[PDB]
Amino acid sequence: CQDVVQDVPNVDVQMLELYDRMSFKDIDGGVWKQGWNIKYDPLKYNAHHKLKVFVVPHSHNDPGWIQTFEEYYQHDTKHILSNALRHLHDNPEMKFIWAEISYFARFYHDLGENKKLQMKSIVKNGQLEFVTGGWVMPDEANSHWRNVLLQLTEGQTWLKQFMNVTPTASWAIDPFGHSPTMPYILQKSGFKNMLIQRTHYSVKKELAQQRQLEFLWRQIWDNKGDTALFTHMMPFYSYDIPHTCGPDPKVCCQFDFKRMGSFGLSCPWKVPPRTISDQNVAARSDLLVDQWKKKAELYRTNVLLIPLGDDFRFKQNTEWDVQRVNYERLFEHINSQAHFNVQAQFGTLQEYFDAVHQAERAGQAEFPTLSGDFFTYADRSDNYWSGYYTSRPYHKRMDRVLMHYVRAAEMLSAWHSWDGMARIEERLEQARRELSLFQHHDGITGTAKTHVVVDYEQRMQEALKACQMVMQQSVYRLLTKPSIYSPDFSFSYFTLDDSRWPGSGVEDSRTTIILGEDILPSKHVVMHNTLPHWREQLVDFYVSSPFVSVTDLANNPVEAQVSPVWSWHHDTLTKTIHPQGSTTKYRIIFKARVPPMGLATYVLTISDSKPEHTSYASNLLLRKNPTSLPLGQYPEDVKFGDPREISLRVGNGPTLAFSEQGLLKSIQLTQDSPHVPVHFKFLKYGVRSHGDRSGAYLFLPNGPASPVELGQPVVLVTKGKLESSVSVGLPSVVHQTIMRGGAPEIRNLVDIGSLDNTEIVMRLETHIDSGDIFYTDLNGLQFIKRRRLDKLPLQANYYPIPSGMFIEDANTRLTLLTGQPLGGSSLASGELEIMQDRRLASDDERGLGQGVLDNKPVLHIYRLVLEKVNNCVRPSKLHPAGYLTSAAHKASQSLLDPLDKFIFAENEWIGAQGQFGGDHPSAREDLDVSVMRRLTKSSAKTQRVGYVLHRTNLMQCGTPEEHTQKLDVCHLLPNVARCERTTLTFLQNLEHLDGMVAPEVCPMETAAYVSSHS
Ligand SMILES: O=C1N[C@@H]2[C@@H](O)[C@@H](O)[C@H](O)[C@@H](CO)N2C1=O
């Protein structure tokens, strides 16, 4: 295993270092506004060294943006694809590339057999080529690597089955910034080449000047280079035709033949395109070839890539003709005029890459190596796209919840082969596809129109229902005596109970377990643990009585804690935000111990009085002029008091101190240790009255944030043996700090209401000597070192916080883990801040046509970990990466993949069993079975189950952490006949594993295996 901590990779271009050196000056470079006047030696080419030009026709189709997926399909895409089939069939030399498989699949299944055969033929002959082959062209900032792989697999699996092809070249022309997580996954999925476009204009200029636009992109910790994937970065401002033929858009626009009038399009540079004729082809070619030759000066080979397309292009038949015939005339002239020394033709992306590498092997070019990412993107001036790291936070949080339900549903149902009548495969396919669709760069990014966001939400809601159905049917089968099991595939044996989504204060949807002497004395509940190691975790349920006790299936009592059900209300009358307690609903909390990738059953029983093993939390409402708070049967009376600082400590864990406004002020790890200053504070950012306005994409603050006026907020303190908390009703936010014995959990019920042109940020102020350094993660896969640059505006220092961020000095580190992707940064030494929500009144001129005024209450969740790290073996100062500690990683897992809770629906569960998976290996803490999915339907003689195994890297800080069993995924199911290592998409076998054993992976490595069973 390569060491991912101690060896600083030696690369030609390291983005953090590059950023440190760059001046980022935004000067007018001429026709190429953000570049310079490119010059080339005409004698560079001759009959012995020609310029090979590949014009690649394409059509960018958004699976939702200003119209819904289905709306675009009916209005544009089905026509584009139908005419593409016709035109490519009739013109053998014409080419076309396609990226979004969600649309292709939607179109394909509506075709007759005659057309399906014609389609298979033009793909087979190379005219129609799929690039990337994912369900969508995913966002690369907010997306979790697990979902990026999910959507890639959904698209490629469909392609292999129906088109018999698997793309090895990726095309990403629209994501707003790019992440190294992509080459990571692609390289492990058979890819050999990739292309990106949206990168900071300053970076494009810098790399173009050194001809480093094509590079071998390796991971920041990879010293050997085995993760390297050849990458091509386009050099200009856009992927449209005016910005892809050469440096001068005024000239290139003349070669977009759809802009002549009848199509309702024109050239903003004022010179229209002109139909090519024998009388002007020489002058036209001279202009075009000159553009090509200038673009060619930016690359290292004599092979040039010229994309030809734009949004939803190549729709009308007349459009196909106008682009094809005119370019055909240019090619004939150019290719026959020796003095040009050019050979131009229509081609595909793979053809371009193949030619480049043939040149490379001929020794005409040596490519540079590069590590780092391409955030935060800016397309012009100070317009940085850091706003979408937070836009529509409700759906960003929903993405993470569905991510987990999909994993749990596929895993729980994978243990058995199911009858088609169970509709398991059906429901799972829908769930995977709806979540996959949302990975689109206008989905999770929060940059779509309001009705399109509603469509995505509806689709995800259906996906959640689908996973619940599969999950509960699975639990019933896994925990019911075989000879008793009698399933009704349409029946709900269990109901999922989720305490954090939509969340308290967002939607009152969780069911209360109703117990009563005259109705039902007890109820069975089941917990599921998707993680490959034993796990204990407090779980809670709503019960109709406070006198409830818990036991496991062996009837052993389990220590429990009952607390009231508190809900906050903005009191329209008194004009205050205060809590109300339930008088008929209570929360029971207890620790559930669940096997690796397994299940554990518990029983809740009612009694007339306080049961021996159940304690009751105390409650303190702090504020002036309080009123009574009755709680029905609740044993203890609520206490009151004037606002005052308070301190709490659950178990033998950390001691937390709070201000009189209910906000964290300090943390004391041990009774010896000092009270470390850790202050939570809420501030607001505004919008400029002059210049450009912030919108769904852009973050253009009107200076540093200003503190939110808190007034005298009401604070509620709940103190219990197992769980305690401090909640405060602040303007726009009900802030809660929960303590269960270890790292505290933070929950924010965010309701920005009608506060227009306001962005709410949560900041942590400490004394940590972090300087200008901080760390943020990329797609929940790796942590990259960031350096605050004062030479760049505030918004440029904001980065995606998909799962976590941290700051540290020689001895102390503060890590904030998130349960949803949001934007954040460290604007000053010792600080950390993350945006909660943003309501913007205007459009930010990027095509959306609206501001963001559809905010809705959302429950954001986090874990705050303060740790001493002076004893940890950390990377040297020059290393571009950072790594979490064991505690921080486990805290992240508690947020992203919590235990699942099921409540038995009926009154009696006959044949109920107490546990499943007790014999499953409890793997090392840094190892995870990211995906478990049965790949075969019941009718297959040889059953196949695929597994994706990921091992992160945790810092060694002096903790013995030992005794754990080896996990061999290939033996998790009986009767294994063979074990093979496959690409991450399970589509290609790479190794036949001897002994049928799947070996564990190295730190930061990800592997996929498929076990076959007879
Ligand atoms: O013409 C445009 N093309 C891209 C779209 O494809 C869309 O997904 C982007 O959000 C949006 C970002 O500006 N886009 C445009 O305005």
Ligand SMILES: CC(=O)N[C@@H]1[C@@H](O)[C@H](O)[C@@H](CO)O[C@H]1O
């Ligand atoms: C779809 C089909 O049956 N056609 C075959 C395919 O099975 C085979 O894998 C491929 C090799 O690339 O050659 C095609 O002609």
Ligand SMILES: [Zn+2]
């Ligand atoms: Zn797009």
